[PDB]
Design an enzyme around this catalytic site. Structure first.
Site, PDB file in Angstrom:
ATOM      1  N   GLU A 145       0.898  -1.197  -0.101  1.00  0.00           N
ATOM      2  CA  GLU A 145      -0.009  -0.091   0.074  1.00  0.00           C
ATOM      3  C   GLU A 145       0.780   1.138  -0.033  1.00  0.00           C
ATOM      4  OE1 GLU A 145      -2.651  -0.690   3.610  1.00  0.00           O
ATOM      5  OE2 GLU A 145      -3.891  -1.846   2.206  1.00  0.00           O
ATOM      6  N   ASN A 162      -9.454  -8.941  12.403  1.00  0.00           N
ATOM      7  CA  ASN A 162      -9.858  -9.457  10.952  1.00  0.00           C
ATOM      8  C   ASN A 162      -9.493 -11.048  10.865  1.00  0.00           C
ATOM      9  OD1 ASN A 162      -8.247  -6.350  10.116  1.00  0.00           O
ATOM     10  ND2 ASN A 162     -10.314  -6.816  10.643  1.00  0.00           N
TER      11      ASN A 162
HETATM   12 MG   LIG Z   1      -2.852  -0.141   5.601  1.00  0.00          MG
END
Ligand SMILES: [Mg+2]
Ligand SMILES: [Mg+2]
Ligand SMILES: [Mg+2]
Ligand SMILES: [Mg+2]
Ligand code: NA
Ligand code: NA
Ligand code: NA
Ligand code: NA
Lengths: 1011, 1011
Positions: free
Chosen positions: A449, A592
């Protein structure tokens, strides 16, 4: 000076990167991986103090232990010991955005250690130290002398101590900074900690020695022959008597051996490398390494003289394997891989980001246990033991550079700038230099990212250049840029396109055939396992299965990043964002995982196991067709157990050893399966069993299963006239139904069964009313905060429509006496701001049998959002220790998540009928329920239910599971219909139209009896 | 700290790199390149002090100027003012190789400067300091306070001074070091120097300013339309009203204009670039920039407010052009180019490494006047101006990273090392960032002689990644590595292979056709022009003309890199390696130019000029076929002159103006060409003349020419009888011939023409004897030292064969009297240590005509090395002012270097018959001479000769041309044959077989007489 604020100074005096050495002194300790005496752990108790800034550190410190310095263990994370808070921020940087400046207030941790050296280490050879993991940056002094500097928290820092070291007592001074310009590259969606979280060690290497060495394995068409080739590099004074020997071992059997002297071949005009040497060992019919059978030779490199005198030795484990993309496909050892994978962070609930062999292995087993084959070091290189373990147990590995500039604007703001090249550069090369020789590592990653900048391009190619054995992948800037060999999107949907500007997420199906497109598709991330998640996970598995260039992906993620906390009393509770007073924080996006931080499975964990099984089955009448997904192994520890039952009554069972080759088929023929002297559902169920125990599995371990309905017989029987009959007492606002000891009361004003008596005893705590809502799932919520509303958020929609505030309105209510039963009639409207959202038309027919039959007819306004559910609710007075049902189970199971659930008669404690999701939501739903038995009650129909001690209201209104309290009696939610759960992502809607309640008209019939 | 010993630290607090800035405050000025008031040069008188070490520096210095301190000018090259020695070494690093260390003895230069700063600069905005070139690293202080550090000698180091200044008197202190780790990446074949060798300047900038800006020119299929895209960045406070204006000017005509506010397009998930804007301007029917025609526009960049307030302006010259490689060819503006290139070092004999407009322009004009169209920047980025001149004058340019590790082993030793990446990276990056906007730059190059390593690979990609308008090139490790767009070998031969292992040098023709191969081929360097050199040049041009994929090259190299030293009398002389004590040194290797350091031409230059011509000529009968090698320009300033002459006697001339289009032909028919009165050789000659003056050419400059022998009328006329018979007088000492006042004395002991008188005047100083050797040219010697014999060197061969010692033996010597003449007949043998090398048989026939006719017959041992020549020689007693011949000229010309020569009657001073090569050698040669006249003497045959006041002995023994003293009388050499000079490389035999004296049998004839 402030090196920690200079992108251009990322280390000072840090030694060169290399594969793990041990400077063994005896070839055998080597061949056997016996511990090396030249390797010394500095782990244990250390001295330590904290200062809000480094400027605040007392010079004395360099010379002498501070007084108030406490003792702590290392490695460890200082936030874990309580010196300051850990922050849970996902995107937004934990510091202010001013590159490359960290703050003035920079929690500096001064660690120190006094230890002894053997005079033996100082006469000759080289002594150096290693730091395997320092967060985030650090200065180092030894014996009051300034040693050096290091940046990057996930890679090993080493310094030569030879010149500072003295006989016996020495002191180490380590100045740790939390923030550094290194931080800018470390924007990971995880708890933000700091400290000496990894192993500190000492290595004694000879003056003349092994600087590095790489190993590579080239094969032939069919892989019958191979070549192991080793590059050995040395450091120090070079002599003609100096030789090298590379030997390959298969246990105690030497497979091959090579001996040579230094002196490379001509590389160019100036010559070759004299301090280098490359040996080529041929191996006949090599044992191939794979995640399925991790065949592993052992290589021993020895530096020594022509005379036999052994200078020193190094070693590694060798995996014969070939990884290649050819014709749009990823190949492992020539076969096309299927990535059944998972993302994993190195995380401990108590230990912080410190990793132990025990934890490691725990994860691995479970991993392997669950039909998993690959892990993704999301998103920094892992603890070194890990590679080894994978190499050992057999998992494919994605090694990722430690780089994420997520918080930037745009993302490539740093990565597209030269000035940050070096920095990034150092982050990819070193991983590589270190991790090269590990078979488990099959693919390289440039990080995460951080957009798409020229810096990526370069490094991509740099890799490409030095290690051609493996593919490079990188998702940023589009999952398809020129810096990736593999289409690696994250959160890409099966069928639907997410046409973002510039960075559209295409349906994976459509994505592969874009004009020009030819690469294999593998999801870096997918199927966000956030809370009550993994809905439609099967829809991926299906695609994969159908699409050749759809080679799988890695679920996100493995384990909940939850933290252990303690209340006043001392009970430990599971913590998350902003619980340590961290701000800003991202609440629960830190959870998560597929398992709880204690390595305790989430119920979705089974859905994965199931869809990732390696045996597929088809059923042709009486014939079973088993197909192999093993690429390389033979069904040599599998036995098929099969069974047929009638509505849970086993009319037959049988077992059959499977004998299927990889990618092969087997035909299993069932013995005529008896007829049934009754009505109901015939079901055949199958399971693979691992009779024996593996290094990862137990014996009698279950690898796969499948189940089908064989046939069903309709109930054409007509009750049996009622002996006795039900009586009706009309009142001004009640309707009495008495029969036996039993009696029902329907409050004439509300229109609802308000009370049930069996004997003198009341059955209800709460009347039994309709239900259209659910306590919001993480999925339903999204990024809807109390401070920043997401209008598209399902919860949001529901809220705004008044799903949660409707007022039912009595429209009708009549009693009627039939010849055989009493007939109750109700009709309600749920409204809000004068809008009629729903209309509910029931019927209760109580007959002499003491049976109450509810018939439900709902209408849903087209213009209102679709309701989570369509059912009934009431609170039971009774409270029983077991729940018994005929249906899909035994684990929690929702409509877009139940391929793993089996139809049967299930028995379990009321307790197991709840799923302690740290962040409370709807839960433990069980689908396609025929029969439910709780205490004196019986429900008969086709519905999904749930039953806990917690009203929805309570769940909805509570944040941490450890804050719930059981209520009186039992909460019983019985759905005629339930809405999908989603999962594709957790920050936008993930519910497939088909799982949404779009009908506008629903029909359902329940039976309320007493046993 | 010692930053100079750290590849890790290469700068500290240095600002970003960007195109050239002047922060104009008024557009008109920007538009007109008028000088910006906000740009301040600090060039001038400075203070200086040198120390052998940094450690030797006195604290005082930062605060106070030393007394011993001198007043030197800046920019300057310290060894120039002779503080230390300038070193001339080629490969060998001039310090011990021990990366990343440099010697303790590291000469340091103390530059201090006191200046004034206007308050106004201090009030508002930013005042920065720019150092365009500092060798090789440095530290910075201002007002006592340490400013920063910088490494890389060929690029600008920029510092913000805003915090350290005060109104008025300010003081700088610059500590410059000769050696750094930078030095490892800077091993070029040149004089190793140091100092502030480039301009120092003061920029003042608005706080909210243009921070960078990019320009790009895109076209349509026929280039009838184009787009200009301007990307602009700003630093400083972002406000809604900020605006950018990009206007395009063609002269005083505003071709286009664009205005927009900051804020770029969505890049990724995080968004876009708020701090930037890209404009797009449409230019119709744009004038195209080329080396042929440098069509330029001016781009005006304005940072102002919504309200019209100018904040600041930046600008740049814009050339609409398209560079690309399609279908294996390099194309410029859709046309495939032909590079007539030359390598260029930045060198002034007086100033060392300091450039000035003067020198630049002169090189450039000279260059263009010589049919050169491009220059390679050998081997670092040049003085910023240089570019601007090329954009303006019209030259294609190869911009080159300042990277060379030639003296490493192997070569790629640093470049294959991750650790050096950084250091290299910034050397490529920064160059790109600075020169991106110049049209003249058409190709990027990653450096020189550094083998081939992964870092090349990375930077290659990066570049590609960042600038795709131009190709990348790199010769290292092979010339066809993965890091190059073009096959760019150096010294590869037209037709012969040089199969070096690892890195063979194929024949250019062959190279192109290798399996797999598809790229274009341009030599990064061909044609070693070291002294008496450039033989075989045509052979390349022929090739480049025949082969599409053979795109030309860059000759090595421009100017001789010698320097002036002074003699006792204060007389300047030219030095080379070790003429300063430099040790070690590579002696004369520093001299490889087409021109002398003073910009005086070497004779080879003419040959380059001629083969580099743009018009090609064919003759068919009476027809001339002219062909334009112009891709874009029309023969719009050329007229063709033609002439017919009979053995130099003009019989017809004419002019015709050229009307030829690019890549087109023209036919030109010639009137009849009257039959000739006599006998002899009719020659036709054509020339191209530029009647109009250009910017780079004077009026009536010759750009092309060509000759063709048409016809020849052989002479069938018999000599007018002799009206006198010569008398032969024998003796025992010699044979005597006499006729009138003239007499010939032949020694019977020696067999040679010992003496001659005309009247009482002796004509000879030394007897007329055969000659089989030459004073070895650089080419002949090679790299052979008297301390390192390179056996293969032609000279070594000659030597060892004793070609220079053979002693002639007299076999026969007889007289005889004919009817009409006297006949002297001889024979000698040169032998050596028993072998008989040559056998020389002659005839002298003196007749009443008074002509003495030498007939010569030579036999050459088969097995001895081919002689440099085969002629005769003698020392004339006459010494005359002019020389007159009829043959090839008028410039020096050798057998493998004579296309640019012309056949005619030439008249020149004796002065001009010597070519003063600093390093003396055989020189002078004029071939295909039919008659030669010096003093009263006339020689007539078909030979090549030379003539000077320097015997080949002298030459063969004097290092500097400045040590030659004219001997008494004239030295004459008349070769029946001469060997070619070669020069494909200067460190191995480059002399092609067709140019070697191989026949074994040689025949020649001469006729000597009186005028
Ligand atoms: Mg991130
Ligand atoms: Mg730093
Ligand atoms: Mg340095
Ligand atoms: Mg060189
Ligand atoms: Na597939
Ligand atoms: Na909740
Ligand atoms: Na050509
Ligand atoms: Na040279």
């Amino acid at each position: 000076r402030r090196d920690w604020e200079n992108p251009g100074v990322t280390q000072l005096n840090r030694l060169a990167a290399h594969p793990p050495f041990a400077s063994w002194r005896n070839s055998e300790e080597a061949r056997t991986d016996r511990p090396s005496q030249q390797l010394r752990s500095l782990n244990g108790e250390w001295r330590f103090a904290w200062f809000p800034a480094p400027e605040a550190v007392p010079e004395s410190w360099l010379e002498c232990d501070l007084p108030e310095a406490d003792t702590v263990v290392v490695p460890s994370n200082w936030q874990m010991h309580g010196y300051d808070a850990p922050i849970y921020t996902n995107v937004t940087y934990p510091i202010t955005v001013n590159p490359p400046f960290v703050p003035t207030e920079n929690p500096t941790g001064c660690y120190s250690l006094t230890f002894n050296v053997d005079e033996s280490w100082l006469q000759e050879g080289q002594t150096r130290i290693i730091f395997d993991g320092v967060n985030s940056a650090f200065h180092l002094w030894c014996n009051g002398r300034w040693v050096g500097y290091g940046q990057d928290s996930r890679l090993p820092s080493e310094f030569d101590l030879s010149a500072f070291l003295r006989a016996g007592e020495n002191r180490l001074a380590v100045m740790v900074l939390r923030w550094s310009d290194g931080s800018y590259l470390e924007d990971q969606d995880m708890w933000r900690m700091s400290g000496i979280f990894r192993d500190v060690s000492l290595l004694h290497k000879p003056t003349t020695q092994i600087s590095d060495f790489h190993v590579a394995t080239r094969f032939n068409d069919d892989f019958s022959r191979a070549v192991l080739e080793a590059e050995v590099q040395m450091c120090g004074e070079l002599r003609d008597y100096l030789r090298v020997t590379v030997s390959l071992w298969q246990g105690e059997t030497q497979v091959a051996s090579g001996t040579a002297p230094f002196g490379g071949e001509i590389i160019d005009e100036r010559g070759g490398y004299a301090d280098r040497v490359t040996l080529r060992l041929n191996v006949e019919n090599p044992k191939l390494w794979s995640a399925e059978i991790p065949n592993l030779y052992r290589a021993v490199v020895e530096l020594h003289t022509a005379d036999g005198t052994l200078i020193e030795a190094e070693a590694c484990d060798v995996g014969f394997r070939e990884v290649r993309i050819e014709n749009g496909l990823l190949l492992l050892n020539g076969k096309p891989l299927l990535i059944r994978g998972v993302n994993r962070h190195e995380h401990h609930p108590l230990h912080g980001q410190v990793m132990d062999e025990q934890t490691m292995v725990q994860d691995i087993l479970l991993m392997k246990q669950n039909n998993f084959n690959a892990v993704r070091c999301s998103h920094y290189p892992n603890h070194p033991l890990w590679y080894t373990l994978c190499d050992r147990y057999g998992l494919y590995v994605v090694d990722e550079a430690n780089i994420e500039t997520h918080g930037m604007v745009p993302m490539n703001r740093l990565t597209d700038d030269p000035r940050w090249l070096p920095a990034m550069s150092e982050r990819v090369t070193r991983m590589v230099q270190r991790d090269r020789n590990h078979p488990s590592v099959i693919i390289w990653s440039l990080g995460n990212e951080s957009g798409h900048g020229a810096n990526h391009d370069a490094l991509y190619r740099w890799i490409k250049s030095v290690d051609p054995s493996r593919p490079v992948q990188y998702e940023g800037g589009g999952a398809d840029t020129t810096a990736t060999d593999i289409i690696c999107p994250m959160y890409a949907r099966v069928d639907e396109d997410q046409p973002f500007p510039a960075v559209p997420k295409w349906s994976i199906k459509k994505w592969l055939s874009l004009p020009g497109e030819t690469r294999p598709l593998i999801l870096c991330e997918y199927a966000h396992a956030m809370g009550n998640s993994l809905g439609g996970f099967a829809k991926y598995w299906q695609a994969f299965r159908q699409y050749p260039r759809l080679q799988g992906g890695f679920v996100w993620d493995w384990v909940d990043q939850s933290l252990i906390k303690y209340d006043e009393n001392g009970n430990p509770w599971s913590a998350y964002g902003g619980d340590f007073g961290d701000t800003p924080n991202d609440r629960q996006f830190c959870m998560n995982g597929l398992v709880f931080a204690d390595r305790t499975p989430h119920p979705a964990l089974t859905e994965a196991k199931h869809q990732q099984q390696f045996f597929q089955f088809r059923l042709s009448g009486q014939t079973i067709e088993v197909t192999s997904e093993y690429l390389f192994r033979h069904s040599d520890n599998e036995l098929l157990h099969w069974m047929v039952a009638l509505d849970g009554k086993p009319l037959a069972s049988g077992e059959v050893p499977l004998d299927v080759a990889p990618q092969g088929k087997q035909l299993i023929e069932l013995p005529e399966l008896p007829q049934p002297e009754s009505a109901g559902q015939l079901w055949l169920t199958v399971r693979v069993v691992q009779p024996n125990a593996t290094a990862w599995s137990e014996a009698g371990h279950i690898s796969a299963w499948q189940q089908w309905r064989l046939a069903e017989n309709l109930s054409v029987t007509l009750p049996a006239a009622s002996h006795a009959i039900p009586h009706l007492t009309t009142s001004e606002m009640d309707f009495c139904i008495e029969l036996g000891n039993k009696r029902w009361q329907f409050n004439r004003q509300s229109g609802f069964l308000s009370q049930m008596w069996i004997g003198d005893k009341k059955q209800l705590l709460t009347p039994l009313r309709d239900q259209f809502t659910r306590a919001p799932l993480d999925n339903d919520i999204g990024v809807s905060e109390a401070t920043r509303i997401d209008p598209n958020a399902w919860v949001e929609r529901w809220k705004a429509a008044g799903h949660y505030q409707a007022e039912a309105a009595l429209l009708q209510c009549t009693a009627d006496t039939l010849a055989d039963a009493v007939l109750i009639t109700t009709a309600h409207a749920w409204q809000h701001q004068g809008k009629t959202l729903f209309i509910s038309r029931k019927t209760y027919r109580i007959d002499g049998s003491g049976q109450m039959a509810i018939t439900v007819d709902v209408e849903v306004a087209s213009d209102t959002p679709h309701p989570a559910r369509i059912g009934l609710n009431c609170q039971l007075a009774q409270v029983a220790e077991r729940v018994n049902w005929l249906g899909l189970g035994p684990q929690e199971n929702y409509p877009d998540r139940l391929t793993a659930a089996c139809f049967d008669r299930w028995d379990l404690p009321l307790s197991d009928m709840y799923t302690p999701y740290v962040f409370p939501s709807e839960n433990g739903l069980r689908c396609g329920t025929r029969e439910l038995n709780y205490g004196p009650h019986q429900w008969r129909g086709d519905f999904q239910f749930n039953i806990s001690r917690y009203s929805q209201q309570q769940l909805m209104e509570t944040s941490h599971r450890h804050l719930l309290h059981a209520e009186e009696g039992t909460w019983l939610n019985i759905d005629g219909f339930h809405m999908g759960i989603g999962g594709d992502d957790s920050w936008s809607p993930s519910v497939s139209a088909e799982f949404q309640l779009s009908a506008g008209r629903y029909h359902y019939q329940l039976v309320w009896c007493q046993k």
